[PDB]
Design an enzyme around this catalytic site. Structure first.
Site, PDB file in Angstrom:
ATOM      1  CG  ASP B 116      12.249  20.108   0.003  1.00  0.00           C
ATOM      2  OD1 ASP B 116      12.797  21.233   0.108  1.00  0.00           O
ATOM      3  OD2 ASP B 116      12.862  19.046  -0.257  1.00  0.00           O
ATOM      4  CG  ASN B 148      14.127  19.859   3.940  1.00  0.00           C
ATOM      5  OD1 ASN B 148      13.622  20.493   4.859  1.00  0.00           O
ATOM      6  ND2 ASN B 148      13.403  19.164   3.099  1.00  0.00           N
ATOM      7  CD  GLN B 149      16.824  27.345   3.744  1.00  0.00           C
ATOM      8  OE1 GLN B 149      17.690  27.111   2.901  1.00  0.00           O
ATOM      9  NE2 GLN B 149      16.142  28.484   3.775  1.00  0.00           N
ATOM     10  CG  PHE B 150      10.155  23.354   4.340  1.00  0.00           C
ATOM     11  CD1 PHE B 150       9.455  24.548   4.157  1.00  0.00           C
ATOM     12  CD2 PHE B 150       9.440  22.229   4.789  1.00  0.00           C
ATOM     13  CE1 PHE B 150       8.067  24.626   4.413  1.00  0.00           C
ATOM     14  CE2 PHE B 150       8.064  22.298   5.048  1.00  0.00           C
ATOM     15  CZ  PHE B 150       7.372  23.501   4.857  1.00  0.00           C
ATOM     16  CB  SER B 185      19.310  19.788   1.014  1.00  0.00           C
ATOM     17  OG  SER B 185      18.714  20.478  -0.060  1.00  0.00           O
ATOM     18  CB  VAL B 224      21.342  15.611  -9.678  1.00  0.00           C
ATOM     19  CG1 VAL B 224      20.354  15.394  -8.504  1.00  0.00           C
ATOM     20  CG2 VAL B 224      20.957  14.813 -10.939  1.00  0.00           C
ATOM     21  CG  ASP B 225      17.442  19.702 -14.087  1.00  0.00           C
ATOM     22  OD1 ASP B 225      16.775  20.289 -13.192  1.00  0.00           O
ATOM     23  OD2 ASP B 225      17.031  19.624 -15.269  1.00  0.00           O
ATOM     24  N   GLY B 232      17.380  10.874   0.609  1.00  0.00           N
ATOM     25  CA  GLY B 232      17.372  11.369   1.970  1.00  0.00           C
ATOM     26  C   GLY B 232      17.423  10.219   2.983  1.00  0.00           C
ATOM     27  CG  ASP B 233      14.376   7.477   2.778  1.00  0.00           C
ATOM     28  OD1 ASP B 233      13.952   8.136   3.743  1.00  0.00           O
ATOM     29  OD2 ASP B 233      13.678   7.262   1.793  1.00  0.00           O
TER      30      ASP B 233
HETATM   31 NA    NA Z   1      15.891  15.637   3.701  1.00  0.00          NA
END
Ligand code: NA
Ligand code: NA
Lengths: 304, 304
Positions: B116, B148-150, B185, B224-225, B232-233
């Site tokens: 990430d 995710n983006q990465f 994400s 969400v902070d 993700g699972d």
């Molecule tokens: Na993910």
């Protein structure tokens, strides 16, 4: 107000036994149950083949240490079933012992799997008996032996209902407040196709509640029914604390609906008059979700 | 009538991540999901402590051998996420390959966990040698992926600075194999403020007439902070479930998966507040049963 259960039993990839029979049902009922997989097999040993690995006592201890180091060793109940290892069972004992020092109110639900019967066959090595008698049963609050295991654990033979209630009395003195003999060779006035189930609970003064149920026998051999039974007894005794009658009615009813569905599906897959394979006989667990949440009562337990 | 899912992911005693975050929800929705536990640890690695054992490629192959010998190697879906080792990931590839020869209609849902972006840069969560394996072996067998983006950048080898560049990356990913791609994400700008994260989804399919078409969506979701493990699972498990019920409607499948996450996380947040260590932030899974069964849509995706 969450209710946590540490269940230490076998895992299979395909099918339902051990933690596989106990987990989904308990989650569906709202329990924060954590599963320690004593073994991880491809499927149960009733199939023509199986492969898998086992958790050894050292690895079981290592897992507990992680929980303890995080202060995550605070449970409301502990649940155990079939184990084939002396060393492993002994580590289980040390753990329940410590979880109990950590939470004196902890209820240990123990299914003392040893074997079955018209005569007996052990399912575990003979050296486990002494551990069960000397170290396991004394720590347990709820035990669910069948007739054969009730006999082994008490040293007495059971030939009738009254001798069975005497053997439960001896088991209560060994330690557990709740004893349920899950299957017996005792005859029922309902017919040759019925068996007797007996339950006893010690519980404000000291009172006894004893119950009897007459239930239809299984025209086949299902795996995981005793694991399901213990998990459900844990849940219903939790929800109806001083009512072994209702708790057993719900436990057994729940088993009924699961097996009924399992049987219809298995016949629908095997042929007509064709005995289903162990694969077709796997409990229809996921499909009985509603029966687990709220089972329709189909047995009445009579208070003795 | 049954839908079988083979899910190979981590198992923990306490908490919900891996198979633990994926199983209960899919069982609640009626799937016969079989779980192969790739590790068994006390809890997730975001805690101060953790202990456990891992399953190696040889043991993974043994368990598959058991399923095979019993002719139980017939699945409708395969589900995988965090994998920690190259030989393990390769074995998983040989298995999916074979499940696909057995059932050419199998859908392999792959969450390609790699890492990430944190600050000015991303970091990997697994050995760099898994990347060529995901690119050449895994992604090409995958039907639905959730990077995710990465991870979309690593797998495509192109960096993403805009939505339009994200869509081009999604096409490269589709060409590598998966017919459904969700960049779960990303760090992309939202017209709703910096408090929101972007979800992009794209799906290719052949319609009744035989035309190959593509549906693309975008969701602007509030951040969400806090740091939740297992989300993700769960997202991948649900993506699997809702695309199965709505095969030709990516917009709805995504609105439902995202809504389910919202209800779980939200319930987890209210609790955590009322008590937060990683133990306090564990997904409130068993208590979200109703929401998993039929989630109220709380987000509407925009059609791209
Ligand atoms: Na993910
Ligand atoms: Na039993």
């Amino acid at each position: 107000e969450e209710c946590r259960v540490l269940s230490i039993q076998s895992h299979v990839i395909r099918g339902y036994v051990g933690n596989r029979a106990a987990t989904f049902p308990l989650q569906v009922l709202g329990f924060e149950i954590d599963a320690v997989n004593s073994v991880q097999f491809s499927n149960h040993t009733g199939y023509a083949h199986w492969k898998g690995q086992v958790l050894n006592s050292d690895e079981l201890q290592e897992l507990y240490e992680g929980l303890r180091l995080n202060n995550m060793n605070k449970y409301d109940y502990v649940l155990t079933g079939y184990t084939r290892d002396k060393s492993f069972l002994a580590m289980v004992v040390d753990i329940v012992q410590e979880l109990k020092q950590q939470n004196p109110r902890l209820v240990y639900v123990c299914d003392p799997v040893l074997g079955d019967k018209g005569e007996g066959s052990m399912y575990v090595p003979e050296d486990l008996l002494p551990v069960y008698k000397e170290k396991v049963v004394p720590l347990a609050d709820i035990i669910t032996p069948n007739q054969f295991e009730a006999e082994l654990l008490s040293g007495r033979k059971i030939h009738s209902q009254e001798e069975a209630l005497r053997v439960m009395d001896m088991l209560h003195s060994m330690g557990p407040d709740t004893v349920v003999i899950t299957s017996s060779d005792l005859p029922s006035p309902q017919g040759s196709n019925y068996l007797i189930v007996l339950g006893s609970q010690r519980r404000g003064s000291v009172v006894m509640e004893r119950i009897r149920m007459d239930i239809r026998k299984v025209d086949a051999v299902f795996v995981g029914t005793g694991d399901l039974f213990a998990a459900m007894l844990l849940a219903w005794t939790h929800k109806h604390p001083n009512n072994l009658k209702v708790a057993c009615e719900k436990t057994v009813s729940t088993l009924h609906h699961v097996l009924q569905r399992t049987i219809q599906c298995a016949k629908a897959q095997a042929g007509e008059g064709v005995r289903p394979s162990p694969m077709q006989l796997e409990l229809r667990m996921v499909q009985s979700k509603r029966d687990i949440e709220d089972p329709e009562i189909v047995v009445q337990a009579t208070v003795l």
